[PDB]
Amino acid sequence: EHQAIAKMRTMIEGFDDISHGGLPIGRSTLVSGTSGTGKTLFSIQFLYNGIIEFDEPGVFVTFEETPQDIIKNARSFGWDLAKLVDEGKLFILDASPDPEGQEVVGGFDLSALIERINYAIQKYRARRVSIDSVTSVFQQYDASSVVRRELFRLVARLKQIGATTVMTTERIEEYGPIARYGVEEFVSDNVVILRNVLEGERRRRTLEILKLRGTSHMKGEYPFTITDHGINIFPLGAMRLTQRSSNVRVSSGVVRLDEMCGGGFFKDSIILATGATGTGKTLLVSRFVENACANKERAILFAYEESRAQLLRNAYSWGMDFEEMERQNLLKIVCAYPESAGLEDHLQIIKSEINDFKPARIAIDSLSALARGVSNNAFRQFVIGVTGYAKQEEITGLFTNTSDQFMGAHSITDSHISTITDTIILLQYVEIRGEMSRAINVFKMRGSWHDKAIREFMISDKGPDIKDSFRNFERIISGSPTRI
Amino acid sequence: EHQAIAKMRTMIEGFDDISHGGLPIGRSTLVSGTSGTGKTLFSIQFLYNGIIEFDEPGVFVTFEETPQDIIKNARSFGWDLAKLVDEGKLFILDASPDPEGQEVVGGFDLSALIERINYAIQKYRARRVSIDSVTSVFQQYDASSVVRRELFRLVARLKQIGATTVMTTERIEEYGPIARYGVEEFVSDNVVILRNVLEGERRRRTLEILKLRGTSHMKGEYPFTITDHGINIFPLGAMRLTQRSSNVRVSSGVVRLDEMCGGGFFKDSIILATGATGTGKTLLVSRFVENACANKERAILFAYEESRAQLLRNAYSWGMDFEEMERQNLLKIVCAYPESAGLEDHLQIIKSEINDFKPARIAIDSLSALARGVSNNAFRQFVIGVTGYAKQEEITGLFTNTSDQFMGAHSITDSHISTITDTIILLQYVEIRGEMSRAINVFKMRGSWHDKAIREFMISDKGPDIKDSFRNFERIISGSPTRI
Amino acid sequence: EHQAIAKMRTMIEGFDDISHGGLPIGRSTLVSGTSGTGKTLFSIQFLYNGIIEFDEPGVFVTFEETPQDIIKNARSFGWDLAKLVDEGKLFILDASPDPEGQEVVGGFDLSALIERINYAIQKYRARRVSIDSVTSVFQQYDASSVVRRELFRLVARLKQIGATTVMTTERIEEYGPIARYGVEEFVSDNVVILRNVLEGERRRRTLEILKLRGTSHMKGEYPFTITDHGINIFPLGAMRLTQRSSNVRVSSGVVRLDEMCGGGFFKDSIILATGATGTGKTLLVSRFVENACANKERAILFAYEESRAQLLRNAYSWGMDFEEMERQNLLKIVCAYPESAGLEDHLQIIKSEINDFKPARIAIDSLSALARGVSNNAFRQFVIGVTGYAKQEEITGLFTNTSDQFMGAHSITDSHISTITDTIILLQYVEIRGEMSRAINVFKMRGSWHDKAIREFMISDKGPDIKDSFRNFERIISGSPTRI
Ligand SMILES: Nc1ncnc2c1ncn2[C@@H]1O[C@H](COP(=O)(O)OP(=O)(O)OP(=O)(O)O)[C@@H](O)[C@H]1O
Ligand SMILES: Nc1ncnc2c1ncn2[C@@H]1O[C@H](COP(=O)(O)OP(=O)(O)OP(=O)(O)O)[C@@H](O)[C@H]1O
Ligand SMILES: Nc1ncnc2c1ncn2[C@@H]1O[C@H](COP(=O)(O)OP(=O)(O)OP(=O)(O)O)[C@@H](O)[C@H]1O
Ligand SMILES: Nc1ncnc2c1ncn2[C@@H]1O[C@H](COP(=O)(O)OP(=O)(O)OP(=O)(O)O)[C@@H](O)[C@H]1O
Ligand SMILES: Nc1ncnc2c1ncn2[C@@H]1O[C@H](COP(=O)(O)OP(=O)(O)OP(=O)(O)O)[C@@H](O)[C@H]1O
Ligand SMILES: Nc1ncnc2c1ncn2[C@@H]1O[C@H](COP(=O)(O)OP(=O)(O)OP(=O)(O)O)[C@@H](O)[C@H]1O
Question: Which Pfam families match (chains A, B, C)?
């Protein structure tokens, strides 16, 4: 034609955003990665979605896995390929060798394969094709040069036929060559790399579109998860800074607090409660959750430090009954160790939990707990993640942070997140007359006025009682004042 | 079968949790690792458990080790294979070569064997098969391409036969290619990697399920141990945050302390005593252990700093007789240098000791001692392990931590564990009138009210005596006060 | 121009500065890089600009891509090669193989090709020539020695013919050998290296001119971007320190401040507002923006911390209506997460936005936000870029910086930029009588006198109210003064 290059949607959540529209039509896209990275999954999900969303028949060529297996495994995702094969929407072209192999097959098969592929494409009027592990084919006894021709031929013919293809290749080093022979990269018009990077006993799955001749696309790596719903990608760098903002207020669960905040938290806001352990962030979180049920609104409490049972014991001891909250189906407590998964997973679990429960308020007790081990950049990326998702979702969110040092803390957050949050509430110990007292302070509020006083507060069975400031002291921020 | 993948339990402690059920039935699982990582052990324990737990016969194909040795070695774990061979539950298919022979017998036996195995499978109605070191077979004179076909043939046949197999492979690099020919990886349906990572003159075994076609599993590495009971794996990231919590109280061994904690320690809770050396953590431990015996309850003292004898001397000088505690079989002292083993091993020894003595209380003298050398992340992982186990086991736990700096310490723990503990007891030196006095402080209690005063205390032959706070002082916490 | 070598301009933005004039005429320039680095784009742009700007006919030799694809792909940048091929200004020489082929040809073809290209050059009176992926030609079965001869031959003949050529080559490692056979480097007269470096999940493209036999050029790597307009390079080290300076003043949007600045900011100046979160930098920015519109002048607010909505809600809460600002087409708000792209991209986006809007004032809210993750050296390079552009463009700029620690901060900027800025405005918290008050201070002004007082200021619906200094206080900068 006389325009750019049209793309075909893969409907693979996230991918079409990363690829600025999907795969280039009429061309083949190389998808490689190490063992267990999700190559096959991608190739099948590409066909399946093609069928289920646009009724575009697909041909699936397999060189190693058996057709039965391919259909067997797809069930893992509630994928019924066998049905689609019947309806003639999907055709699995078995190209795998037989238990009784034979020599030299690097030419007959090439033209014969295309004949068959072409045959099938024509027979079912296939629009999408995906070849799984073309690597394995010439993995018979070939050199880079021989590999480059065969690929060139394969790609070329498929091009002529006008098939939008997905080719799967295997790697051996997470960051070494892009594909086995170090040739495939240059022969393909489009290249996608699926990575399963180790790093600290944890595994992180990323996807990168290295290149797409003819168009633009997002660059770099993007984390993704393989679930019961297949590949799920999060273009954390694609989320737009177009969050909705209003002047509507909401209570904290603490009236005096609400006063200090100039009338309560904003509905469209992210609040952060920082302080040493014991200061009472976990309390403010409970009082925040309860206030959402007292107004018959649903709230989720993602706890990463205390057990489900403990949260209940301590909550009851502060009055507020969490038991009822759950029965009335207004409050949902999750709970899970940060070590039970990687940030990417957690991010997703938080999201899905939000979708299946339509929360009005969300509270994550201790982001500081989720920052364990993980790198700072990976962490900030997570924070921006859960933070922005909440903002664009009209969900008020309260996040907890435990500073590494009680008293003397010179920075609000060790991880440096305060800049991403709308309202900051700071809890701190104050040594007074040989005793450890607390103090609460509305450090900042973007749209409101808020109290500038550093009020001391006690904790009882009733909960939190915000009293007066220490007007007669100096160096209070430090934790060890000087009475005057 | 139009359903998800079905797995078969290995009964190898921890494995079925990581593999979300066990090995996928009728499929082969590759298990590779470097020399001495426990490949053989895995494959055998796989068959054994099969025979002993579900009476599923098993065929074990060995290419290098002799059947006599395979039986001889198994005795190391109290495995009598010889017996199972007679009972015809287990059949060892000797495929090893002899001191003499010929050559040019490539795929010759690869085909003959696929029969010899099919034979024994039918003959003993085998359900589980394990081939040890298939690698060594084509370690005769082959290339990556020749190896891919032979494997694919073998796997394929075994799959037709419907047997659930485990294939052993060797590697040369702990983090390099998955298997010798970097081809096996893609040929197997399932990949398990056993690593024996060095790092700092210490060895650390970890197992990882790289992929499982068709199902889910836990990602990343997981520490494990090889004991007299075989492979023991700890899915530290699989432990759920569903610990039981009660309001029952227990004594610290110090009445005045119990008062400050507003009625004593909670049965279901983890207590942390922090302070510079000499502050007296070891004392509070002794007193906490004695109190459990005074109530005829079993308690264990894991000491990592003082000898068995020294603990006695110092305990006796504080009154409390540890001699009697042991005779009455109410108190159990362990003692071992953190350097005598890796965290994984320690964690396990702690667990087993708890199982063989049903403790009601537990005290680990110096967590900070176990933190020597080890990485902060490997440590936190150990803490969560011991911490959680105790919690879900209704065992009250007291842990000791020596801060790196006496006086001035701006953070409770250098390792940052305060966030994982329920009750925090802080001991600190206070310079008053040219003398080093002490002070005790209940820094926090999640369920109780506890005293906020920083009470000075002395140590005598009677033990700890908690006096009054320094109401007329400033900057106490700092260590160097200033009287008003 | 004092350079011994006559050069030809590429008209590729930035390249001619880097190459000190363009590509040496009558010589060949090797352009190598990994897959997807922009080799083809470079060579095509080279011919294109040649035809459009100088009516210099061009010959494009392709060994892998198809003439249709090369034309199809160029539409991505709005270039119509097809039209140029008709007019006879561009000739694409198809040298790619056919999907039927044989074996053996990379030699006489080297002579057949030479004679071919000489035909095209003579037929079209070509002046520019670019051979895309010569690498792939002897990628048939050759050794380093055979390659060196063939290249040298090709190059040599092209030189005789008098053609200025661009030869593309592929590399596998981003910093390893220059080209595949590690032989091309020395055979070519000039060598250009296109890199696409990973590093932290982001991709950074750089261009480097390694050598140019005969003349000088800019040494090292230079960041560039591929856009709808092709390759765009920023010779950040080529920016001359010859910015225009005037004594003209402009308001800051706050009258009291202007007084403090001895009559307002300088038109030709870069201002820096630093302080901990909550201090009000974002407020001053708003007021700085609003003031340019109040005087019917265009201004751009690049926000990297708050959404477009939030900025509006908060702005309105401080009076000043941002809604109207936009309608009147006097104020333009951008908004974007720093993680949504690398510095290079950001820098370019800021520049374009400036050209398509002719701003008089610009405000980047939080440079410290664009400093997330990125290396300090990469950051400073970014700051020098935006800062310099602004300066030479008579555009007044207000940049924001949040300090990692509230109160006690010993340095103006953690990134150490203060030395690059002309005027510095410092905001800070002052603990006074158990309360958090703010203090504003004109730390420095290069051309003015400015007030040296550290005035406290309050924030209201009306905005910022600058009051008086704390004359009766000591240790103000500390954050917790002493009343004397
Ligand atoms: N329902 C599921 N939920 C979560 N993970 C799953 C699920 N099903 C499969 N997986 C995971 O997805 C991976 C499957 O990878 P896939 O078969 O798509 O291709 P590959 O690993 O790229 O290449 P190969 O053909 O060599 O396996 C496995 O590693 C497995 O752990
Ligand atoms: N019934 C109670 N009466 C008085 N104080 C209580 C009561 N229960 C808990 N507390 C106090 O509250 C503190 C614990 O607070 P909380 O659970 O809110 O979370 P946190 O300090 O933010 O985080 P962390 O989990 O590290 O403790 C204890 O230090 C204790 O003094
Ligand atoms: N009772 C035991 N207690 C603790 N460790 C043991 C015991 N018995 C054996 N081991 C250890 O287990 C390992 C045995 O490894 P195994 O024979 O299972 O297979 P492998 O090392 O994976 O492969 P290979 O056949 O090359 O040895 C040894 O390294 C040894 O130190
Ligand atoms: N008979 C005693 N009379 C008075 N004080 C004693 C007596 N025995 C020990 N102490 C005191 O107790 C301190 C040692 O305390 P302890 O054994 O409790 O452990 P710790 O300080 O927690 O840890 P560490 O092993 O680093 O010393 C000494 O510094 C000393 O002052
Ligand atoms: N309009 C556009 N805007 C932004 N990027 C684009 C645009 N068009 C193409 N690109 C990018 O430019 C790159 C094209 O690279 P190009 O075809 O120039 O040569 P190459 O990658 O050096 O070599 P090869 O022939 O192996 O691909 C792709 O990586 C693609 O993402
Ligand atoms: N209507 C208002 N009345 C009184 N004070 C207000 C009002 N709106 C905002 N504020 C105050 O201004 C502060 C927020 O300031 P601002 O938006 O200027 O940016 P910042 O502190 O420089 O940077 P950031 O808050 O984005 O980290 C709040 O802490 C609050 O005290």
Answer: ATPase
